[model samples]
Target: MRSPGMADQRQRSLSTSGESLYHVLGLDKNATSDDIKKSYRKLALKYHPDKNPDNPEAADKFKEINNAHAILTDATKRNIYDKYGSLGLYVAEQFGEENVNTYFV
Candidate 1:
């Protein structure tokens, strides 16, 4: 049996598949900016670290929601995520952050 290398592990972890940013926030691909924000606010409040003190799981959920919100709210990152999923964004960063195209810009 062979152990996976660091790079392989990283790639495996970044794979999004069915767990896309939209799924993370309980929204669909067609959700608008307002929809995303509304869901984020609800989840953020529910999983907030302060509200769930002593609950490590809730803390993790809070962080996950925040991370998803950050990416989904950004036009560039959201475009990459929508087109390529999380792994695509990782690859874009690996190649060069400066090279990632912003269609609107």
Candidate 2:
């Protein structure tokens, strides 16, 4: 989207509540489950601490990649993510509810 590398016009923005998965991994929201796994593998290999001991940020990024993959790769979790977005997921998780609550007055 936006010819890539154009962060401002991204179709979706990252929310603070979700595990900071996409930001550190640099994935697009439109990514399919397969895309998620593919990107995670690429980024993980690139930023792995053992492979990039000289690059301190690699480890943090590696963890983020793993966390992002964990969420987006799961059928249920990915469904929640697709419908509710990251903030909604955080609210649902905090409330221990599996389905999102769309309470409107």
Candidate 3:
């Protein structure tokens, strides 16, 4: 059986390519604020570390869901994500620009 640490490492490797935050939350890009909140609540409860103490996989999933919700609920982050997806947003941040016009402009 895979240890929790090993499973977490595997999950991190799989997500290294920058999975869509929307997909992480099981949401469509068109999901509303209410939808986002509801989904976050549901997933948070299900995968919460406290709720799944034995399942390191669920803990990792919980973190992903929480991170996704944090970005999607914030207007600026959401805009950046909508425009650039995950990697582009990271590049924009590294470049210290709110907008990545240089890349797509």
Q: List the residue pairs that clash in candidate 2.
A: none
Compose the digit string of candidate 1's lDDT tens values, residues 1-105: 022112233334443432456666776435576776677679989998799889878776655565455455556655555444444444452342356423211
RMSD to truth, every model: 8.1, 9.1, 10.3
**For model 2, what is the alpha-carbon lDDT of residue 73?**
52
Q: Give the TM-score of candidate 2.
A: 0.49
Ranking of models by lDDT: 3, 2, 1
Better of 1 and 2 by TM-score: 1
Score candidate 3 by TM-score against the native: 0.54
What is the TM-score ranking, best to worst? 3, 1, 2
lDDT of each: 0.54, 0.54, 0.56
Per-model TM-score, in order, reads: 0.53, 0.49, 0.54
Q: State the displacement of the C-alpha of residue 75, model 3, in Å, after optimal TM-score superposition.
A: 3.1
Task: Estimate the overall C-alpha local distance difference test score of candidate 1.
Answer: 0.54
Segments of candidate 1 deviating more than 4 angstroms: 1-18, 80-105
Q: What's the true lDDT of residue 25 in model 2?
A: 64
